[PDB]
Design a protein around this ligand. Structure first.
Ligand SMILES: [Cl-]
Ligand SMILES: [Pt+2]
Lengths: 91, 91
């Protein structure tokens, strides 16, 4: 049926979403790593309004990453349920 | 009937993906802008630090450009799919 192609398409879309999430997560966590290290490298050197801006940005980003992990976990769980359901209808 | 439930569910998921994208892009473009300002500003191991910052800015810049592309493509494939699915539930 034409549900077979839709299931097949969505399965691929979902896999790509997963793969692109892992890449994105790696890039951003490395980025956050390298910003965190710098907040402390500037804190050594310590005019120092820069430490405050940098510390704010780390926290901004870190919070974004923790939030993001939670959102992706919920989306993934919805998509797998839905994918499973759709497979059953195709069977 | 089951198809209508799937469609309804997928729709909400795709909608939530979009809105969460809108949020994240906004959150990360502000972030980038504030990095931008801070780089500019510090330009006015101190010069190690401007190098560390300007590198980060461009990594993030590159990342956001690429995500735009990836999201654009995934949004359209999901839109196409919902429409093909829509066509199938009311048939
Ligand atoms: Cl990590
Ligand atoms: Pt991390």
């Amino acid at each position: 049926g034409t549900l077979n192609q839709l299931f097949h398409n969505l399965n691929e879309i979902v896999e790509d979403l997963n793969k692109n999430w892992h890449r994105e997560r790696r890039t951003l966590h490395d980025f956050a790593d390298e910003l965190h290290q710098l907040v402390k490298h500037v804190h050594h050197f310590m005019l120092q309004d820069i430490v405050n801006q940098l510390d704010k940005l780390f926290r901004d980003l870190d919070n974004h990453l923790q939030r993001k992990d939670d959102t992706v976990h919920h989306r993934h769980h919805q998509l797998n349920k839905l994918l499973a359901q759709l497979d059953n209808l195709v069977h």
